[PDB]
Structure formats: C-alpha cells, structure tokens
Structure 1
C-alpha cells in the first residue's frame, strides 16, 4: 500500500531524465506509472529533478494550495517539468497524452514527519 509520499513520486517524479525525451514520452510515462489504470488521468505533471531538491520545496515559500489550504510550497527555484495533458482521441484503454515541456516553479503540498511532498498542486 503506497504511502502518499511514494505515490507522489510514482505519479510526479522522473529524475532520470533531464526533460521530455520525445513526445510520446507522455504516453510512455502515464502508462508506465499506472496513471492510465482504472481510467485515463486528465492531466499529470512530472518533475525532472532529484527527489532531494523537490522534497526541499517543503521549506520554500509557503502558499495557499489551489483548493483553499495552507501546507503548500512553491519552489524558490525553477524546475523542469513535463505536463501530460490527455487529448481528444483518448479512449481508455488508450489514453493519449500530449507532452508539453517547460522549465517552471512547482507548488506542492507537504505532509508528515519527514515533511515530504504529497500532492503536486500547481506550477507557475
């Protein structure tokens, strides 16, 4: 049973890549990190940083999470991300995603001792 902290890592964390590798990168990852399982996930962004530099966002500028809450942090720093937005042509079983690559600020929600990222909230 995945602890949230690792679930986050499975849906959000690809450190082994500098950035998107192609464009069916999205399709490879969605699939490969089980997001396309019980349905196709609407959208999912992936961070291309070390877990260590990401977990340390929990000590960076504290912001309100989109949903109204208060355990969210935004990186002081810019970080490379790939947004997997799903498309029109996407019919789970076959979820089709569009690789949109960027190098921007992540805002995540932190929880637990150790206080790690748990939810990816947004990116600006």
Structure 2
C-alpha cells in the first residue's frame, strides 16, 4: 500500500534542490519517481521546499479545488517549483519532458488526521 500522503511526497516533493537544476531534471525525476511506469504522466509539478513548509499550506488560504470540492488551500507565499510537461518526441516507454522552473503559490487538497497534503491542485 502507499498512503495518500506518501504518494504526494513521492510525486511532488523535492526538497534536495532549491530549483530546477538543469534541462535534464524532469526526464530524470519523472522516471526516478516512477511517474513514467504505466504511461507518460503528461504533466507533474515538484516543490523545492521543506516538507514542514508544504504541510503548513493546509492551514493557509482555503480555496475551491478544481473539482468543486472545498478542501484546497493556497500558500500565502510563492514557493520554488519545477514544472514538467511531456514533449512531442515523448513516446512511451521513452517519455520526454521540458523542465520549467518558477516561483508561484501552490494549491493543494488536504485531508486526514493529521491534516496533510494529498493532491496537488494547481499553482498561481
């Protein structure tokens, strides 16, 4: 099994780097995190912050999730994020990604006891 909360960290957390290191970053991380095992996950975002920092977002600004549910929260501060979007030459099993670093507010769905992030919703 893999808890909702550990799957979030596996898919979205990357505190070991402060930014998108190189153009190689996405191809490497997407595969590394097993995001390219059943298909090429089209898009994925990695947050370069500490796990305490991202968890604290569950107590920040409450906003509507893209799905209409209401358990989403927006971060008061912008965080360092790396955006990975699948290219055109990307053909499974050879998935390809364009790495894109930025600093934006993250929106995450939170749930549970403790109330921890379980889904990345967006960034603005």
TM range (shorter): over 0.9
- Offset at residue 116 of structure 1 (A): 0.3
Cα distance per residue 1:32-84 (max 9 Å; x no partner) = 00000010001000000001000000000000011111000000111000010
* Distance in 1 of aligned mates of 2:81 and 2:55: 15
- Offset at residue 24 of structure 1 (A): 1.2
Partner of 2:96: 96
Cα distance per residue 1:9-28 (max 9 Å; x no partner) = 00000001000110110000
Partner of 2:112: 112
TM-score (normalizing by structure 2): 0.99
Q: Which runs of 5+ in 2 are unaligned?
A: none
Secondary structure of the residue aligned to 1:102 is strand
Matched residue count: 124
TM-score (normalizing by structure 1): 0.99
* Distance in 2 of aligned mates of 1:110 and 1:43: 20
- Write out the 4+ residue segments of structure 1 that deviate beyond 3 Å after TM superposition: none
* Distance in 1 of aligned mates of 2:98 and 2:4: 26
Cα distance per residue 1:97-122 (max 9 Å; x no partner) = 01010010000000100100000000
CA-atom RMSD in angstroms: 0.5
Secondary structure of the residue aligned to 1:94 is coil
* Distance in 2 of aligned mates of 1:34 and 1:70: 29
* Distance in 1 of aligned mates of 2:35 and 2:54: 21
